[PDB]
Design a protein around this ligand. Structure first.
Ligand SMILES: Cc1cn([C@H]2C[C@H](O)[C@@H](CO)O2)c(=O)n(C)c1=O
Ligand SMILES: O=C(O)CNC(=O)C(=O)O
Ligand SMILES: [Fe+2]
Length: 420
């Protein structure tokens, strides 16, 4: 009921770490090459100067909020990482010129950490494919903050660890039991002026948490189920700091290949001799239409609106997604055309044959709600606060637009479907 935490200044700290955090590894700067250090530190600097790191206008727990920390997702080409309901797209790295050079740097840093991890994971066990898979980092999220540009920072509420740049949380959307590697770059009770990473047992508020000091060049690893059993935070220092958190993102349903295939799957129900607006369906089996409208929603809100909300962003560091994102829109547009098709069938010249109503009604109302939601987050008050960062509500078109088969809805079509 006093608020305490532990640091290496305490006696119990070492027995707490060894007996209650055996899966938390720390490798001090003195263990990593100076050849690697300077290179990755130079990378954080070019990328920062180039303005590739932005804070995200997230909508956590129903509220629109800008994030104190600025970040950049770098990793396998075609891969994405969902973080706080927002889906970040990877600026690609050389998976078999400055911005391109840095991604090369963070690629070797990745290989490095990967090695450090499998090793430490083997030393821990004291199959071998589980180790390999759980340390196979496919992405790295880079972060940055300060110099205290924050008017007032929130104070850690449980162990008096002082100010914090990132509150207690778990790294989510990761492969089960996957490890996480962090390279900390601090460019200059716990010492207020130094960055630390906080730790605590989930649900546990009375076991003093650990605040481990982070100096320029230090790396820490979270192995096995540690990330799931414990929460961590990042207590703030006085200087600004960078960091690259390499992870193994659960990317089933999360790569360009996956979503492209999903599209080809839905369009298998449309005569594909030519690409015009006389879209005809091979069948109106309530089940196939279900899957068709579901994929329509998936490519629309999980990919298109998600990509454009970040507005002109990754484009300042990569063009990689321009054409694939242009193709998903073409694909989606064709799907708007299948919707109109189904709509023409349902209300045309049998009547139980309206299994085509209780098979697409759920997906259409969802397309309705999610469209308002996104349109709102776009022309919202907070969203007025950079020019090249402001969210875009694409795909968007005015009711008076001829090229689109249906309107941006607003219902009427949805209401009318209640009919019966
Ligand atoms: C769940 C979760 C949260 N945060 C950060 C976002 C903010 O910086 C802070 C509070 O949401 O935690 C984060 O960086 N990752 C990778 C997560 O998986
Ligand atoms: O910077 C760190 O040490 C840890 N950062 C994070 O929590 C993160 O990137 O999600
Ligand atoms: Fe984290």
């Amino acid at each position: 009921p006093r608020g305490s935490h532990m640091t290496p200044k305490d006696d119990e700290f070492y027995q707490q770490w060894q007996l209650k955090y055996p899966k938390l590894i720390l490798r001090e700067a003195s263990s990593v090459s100076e050849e690697l250090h300077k290179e990755v530190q130079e990378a954080f600097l070019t990328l920062h100067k180039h303005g590739c790191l932005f804070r995200d206008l997230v909508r956590i727990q129903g509220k629109d909020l800008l994030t104190p920390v600025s970040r950049i997702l770098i990793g396998n080409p075609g891969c994405t990482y969902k973080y706080l309901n927002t889906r970040l797209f990877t600026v690609p790295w050389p998976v078999k010129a400055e911005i391109a050079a840095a991604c090369e740097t963070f690629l070797k840093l990745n290989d490095y950490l990967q090695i450090e991890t499998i090793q430490a994971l083997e030393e821990l066990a004291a199959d071998e494919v589980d180790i390999k898979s759980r340390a196979a980092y496919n992405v790295t999220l880079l972060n940055f903050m300060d110099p205290q540009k924050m008017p007032y920072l929130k104070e850690e509420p449980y162990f008096g660890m002082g100010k914090m740049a990132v509150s207690w949380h778990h790294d989510e959307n990761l492969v089960d039991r996957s490890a996480v590697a962090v390279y900390s770059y601090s460019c200059e009770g716990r010492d207020p002026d130094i960055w630390h990473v906080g730790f605590k047992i989930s649900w546990d508020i009375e076991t003093p948490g650990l605040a481990i000091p982070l100096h320029q060049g230090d790396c820490y690893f979270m192995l096995d189920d540690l990330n799931a059993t414990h929460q961590h935070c990042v207590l703030a220092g006085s200087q600004p700091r960078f960091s690259s958190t390499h992870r193994v993102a659960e990317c089933s349903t999360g790569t360009l290949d996956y979503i492209l295939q999903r599209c080809q799957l839905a369009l298998q129900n449309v005569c594909d001799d030519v690409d015009n607006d006389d879209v005809s369906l091979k069948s109106f089996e309530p089940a196939v239409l279900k899957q068709g409208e579901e994929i329509h929603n998936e490519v629309e809100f999980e990919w298109l609106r998600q990509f454009w909300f970040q507005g002109n962003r990754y484009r300042k560091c990569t063009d990689w997604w321009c054409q694939p994102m242009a193709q998903l829109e073409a694909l989606w547009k064709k799907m708007e055309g299948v919707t109109n098709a189904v709509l023409h069938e349902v209300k045309r010249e049998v009547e139980q044959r309206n299994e085509i109503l209780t098979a697409i009604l759920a997906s259409l109302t969802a397309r309705q709600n999610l469209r308002r939601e996104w349109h709102a987050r776009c022309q919202s008050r907070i969203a007025r606060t950079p020019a090249d960062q402001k969210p875009e509500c694409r795909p968007y078109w005015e009711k008076d637009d001829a090229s689109m088969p249906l309107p941006f809805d607003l219902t009427d079509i949805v209401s009318e479907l209640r009919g019966q």
